[PDB]
């Protein structure tokens, strides 16, 4: 309860303290324990191949220069004291843009311990790149990682470990992605060697499974309905040249518009997606239907009923093969 | 292991140190070695004629004022010590917007050496302008460069060189552009003379080859299908005036929509691209097909079969000439 005594203790700790030197400089590497409390994953972008992550990033390490005696309490100091203390140069290797929230003050926590242990917490919103394999899109499964590494200190000066083992990362259940579900998360610790030296690495990875519900309503169902619409021409008499030709034209044009719109919502990848294959297949059926009437019109100047039993049967077989392959 | 001894050594180095003066001020120019470890090339924009580059920029130079003895170690100091040290005024000449990542601290590394050598590393995300020749688009090849130059110090005060020769730039294989492939990269060192004086220059250039896979599915294939769709009118009887006229109208209108959409995704260049030539050629065929029926309708109040053998033959010849010219 003696604020002056606490003030003297803290001033003694910071007297002669050199922020430029890591703890145990020139000696054994300092072990830094890390925990992450995930707040939310706001966005997952296929076009930019990145995701936005908000989390509470906490670092644990012991600095004997900050050890104090006579106070059986954990000193929770103002966040502005972190500028006078050494902190690990932790950075995210795969991030594209990140910041620390600063309202109403910087989202930062410093909590000292009698033995010299320092707890350093930060609330960070980060946009991390995540390369995606869209070959099976929209029935694909993605593995997005978050790489944690020291920038300047090599393994000879600093070491990273997940504090608490597999329980180091919490809040995974808080992730509520409308388009994805968190199948699994993993924690990986390893050493990465560059030209400048070997650096510690912590990796946090999520396996995301895309939800097919949106794409059934948005793309798959409209494509099927247009294909069924083309089948109406078979029951229309052949003398109705204007009617059957108009039916063939509009179904083909509508199919093209759907195909063009979908590809504009995704990155300009050179390979063919699963959804593209379905749209190409649907375009073939409607195009064949218009060609079917042209053949009927040509011979006229039994075929229709024969065509009535082939296209729905073939389209059902095409759907069965397509869904079994991608599920 | 004597932190106090190291603290005294570093304090001695910075005592009387003048950041305003370059090493060997008034004498021989200081040689600065540079290496780049490319992290990723996030975006390549044709509309803005620029690309986004993330890299680890490292500078090597010797400052005898920072030489220390008695410590057989490389001092990896906190990144905040860089504010008390002289650093080269390196800037990127062709960049449009750049920043240094600062989470959880500034992505900066300072590593001293006993002989006075200083290693200065920065993780920089930069948007560099790259003029593009879109005459052969989308079958074009682009050469995007990254110019590195000193802003204030001339060649009499500073010199640049690629540390490691042709191996100075690494991580080129990490570049994963969905639309481009890295054919080759080159390193160029030269001197550039301005009014204020002659300045050292380092240039890093990439040759990018665009992938045609996306454009075949998005633009080329839909255009061909519409052109084939116009050929259906030939097999339809001439008395079906509504049917054949509707076929000609819709194919022409669809061709215009595709042409308009493509040009909106590219900068308003005044010259004609390769893809524009193909769209213009496809528009001619569909327009001629509608004119063909008008001639048939006019004479009526053999031509169709004669037209059946000309347009597919001419269109195949047009495609053969087009692809051979641009490949």
């Amino acid at each position, epitope marked *: 309860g003696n604020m002056s005594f606490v003030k003297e203790t803290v001033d003694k700790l910071l007297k002669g303290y050199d922020i430029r030197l890591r703890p145990d400089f020139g000696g054994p590497p300092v072990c830094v324990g890390m925990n992450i409390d995930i707040a939310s994953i706001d966005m997952v972008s296929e076009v930019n191949m990145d995701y936005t992550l908000t989390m509470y990033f906490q670092q644990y390490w012991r600095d004997k220069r900050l050890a104090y005696s006579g106070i059986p309490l954990n000193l929770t100091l103002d966040n502005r004291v972190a500028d006078q203390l050494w902190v690990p140069d932790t950075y995210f290797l795969n991030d594209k843009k990140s910041f620390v929230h600063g309202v109403t003050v910087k989202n930062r926590m410093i909590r000292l311990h009698p033995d010299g242990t320092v707890l350093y917490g930060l609330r960070i919103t980060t946009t991390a790149a995540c390369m995606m394999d869209l070959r099976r899109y929209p029935l694909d499964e993605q593995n997005c990682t978050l790489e944690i590494e020291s920038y300047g200190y090599t393994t000879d000066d600093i070491e990273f470990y997940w504090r608490g083992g597999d329980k180091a990362v919490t809040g995974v259940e808080r992730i509520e992605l409308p388009q994805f579900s968190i199948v699994e998360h993993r924690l990986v610790s390893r050493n990465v*060697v560059f030209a400048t030296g070997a650096y510690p690495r912590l990796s946090l990875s999520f396996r995301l499974k895309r939800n097919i519900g949106y794409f059934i309503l948005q793309t798959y169902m409209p494509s099927i309905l247009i294909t069924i619409l083309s089948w109406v021409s078979f029951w229309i008499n052949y003398d109705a040249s204007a009617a059957r030709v108009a039916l063939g034209i509009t179904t083909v044009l509508t199919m093209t518009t759907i195909n063009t719109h979908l590809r504009e919502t995704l990155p300009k990848i050179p390979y063919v997606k699963a959804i593209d294959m379905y749209l190409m297949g649907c375009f073939v059926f409607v195009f064949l239907a218009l060609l079917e009437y042209a053949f009927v019109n040509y011979i006229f100047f039994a075929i229709d009923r024969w065509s009535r039993i082939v296209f729905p049967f073939t389209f059902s077989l095409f759907n069965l093969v397509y869904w079994l392959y991608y599920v | 292991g004597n932190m106090s001894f190291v603290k005294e050594t570093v304090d001695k180095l910075l005592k009387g140190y003048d950041i305003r003066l370059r090493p060997d001020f008034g004498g021989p120019p200081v040689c600065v070695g540079m290496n780049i470890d490319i992290a990723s090339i996030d975006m390549v924009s044709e509309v803005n004629m620029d690309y986004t580059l993330t890299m680890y920029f490292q500078q090597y130079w010797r400052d005898k004022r920072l030489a220390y003895s008695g410590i057989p170690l490389n001092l990896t100091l906190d990144n905040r010590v860089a504010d008390q040290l002289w650093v080269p005024d390196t800037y990127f000449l062709n960049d449009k917007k750049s920043f240094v990542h600062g989470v959880t601290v500034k992505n900066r590394m300072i590593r001293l050496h006993p002989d006075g050598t200083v290693l200065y590393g920065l993780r920089i995300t930069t948007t560099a302008a790259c003029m593009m020749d879109l005459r052969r688009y989308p079958l074009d090849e682009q050469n995007c460069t990254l110019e590195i130059e000193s802003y204030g110090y001339t060649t009499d005060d500073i010199e640049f060189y690629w540390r490691g020769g042709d191996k100075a730039v690494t991580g*080129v*294989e*990490r570049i*994963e552009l969905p639309q481009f492939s890295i054919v080759e990269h080159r390193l160029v060192s030269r001197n550039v003379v301005f009014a204020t004086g002659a300045y050292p220059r380092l240039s890093l250039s990439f040759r990018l080859k665009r992938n045609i896979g996306y454009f075949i599915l998005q633009t080329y294939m839909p255009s061909i299908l519409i052109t084939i769709l116009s050929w259906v009118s030939f097999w339809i009887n001439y008395d079906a005036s509504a049917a054949r006229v509707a076929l000609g109208i819709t194919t022409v209108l669809t061709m215009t929509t595709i042409n308009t959409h493509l040009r909106e995704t590219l900068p308003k260049i005044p010259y004609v691209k390769a893809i524009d030539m193909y769209l213009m050629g496809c528009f001619v065929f569909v327009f001629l097909a509608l004119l063909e029926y008008a001639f048939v309708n006019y004479i009526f109040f053999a031509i169709d079969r004669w037209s059946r053998i000309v347009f597919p033959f001419t269109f195949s010849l047009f495609n053969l000439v087009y692809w051979l010219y641009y490949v």
Partner: nanobody
Framework: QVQLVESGGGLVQGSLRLSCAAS????????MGWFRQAPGKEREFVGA????????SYADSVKDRFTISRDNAKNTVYLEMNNLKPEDTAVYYC??????????????????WGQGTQVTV
């Protein structure tokens, strides 16, 4: 999870073409590397190539002599060893590297390795 099998070694006195077939989650490991280990000497980097784009790198010793290329249809990476020398007597391995696993020249950055073929000239 990537499985690597390499073949095409043997003993010669010439041009030789090694090969390495990959299977599994190759998307997460877009970089394939070639390494050789002389008896007693540390494992040496030979060359690396990306699955997509065909970007390649080589060591100075094997520069302008060895060529590396891959075909994605067979998921195979092949090392063409031409103008062989007696110094090129080592066990040749095939390895795959993660996207953010670091530099190419360091074998410890690679996760999955092949069996290794012994080549003696």
């Amino acid at each position: 999870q990537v499985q690597l099998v390499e073949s095409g070694g043997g003993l010669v006195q010439g041009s030789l073409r090694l090969s390495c077939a990959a299977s599994g989650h190759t998307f997460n490991y877009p970089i394939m590397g070639w390494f050789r280990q002389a008896p007693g000497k540390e494992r040496e980097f030979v060359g690396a190539i990306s699955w997509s784009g065909g970007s390649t790198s080589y060591a100075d010793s094997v520069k302008d002599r060895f060529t590396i290329s891959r075909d994605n249809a067979k998921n195979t990476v092949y090392l063409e060893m031409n103008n062989l020398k007696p110094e090129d007597t080592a066990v040749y391995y095939c390895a795959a590297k993660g996207r953010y696993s670091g530099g190419l020249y360091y074998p410890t950055n690679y996760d999955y390795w092949g069996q290794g073929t012994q080549v003696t000239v």
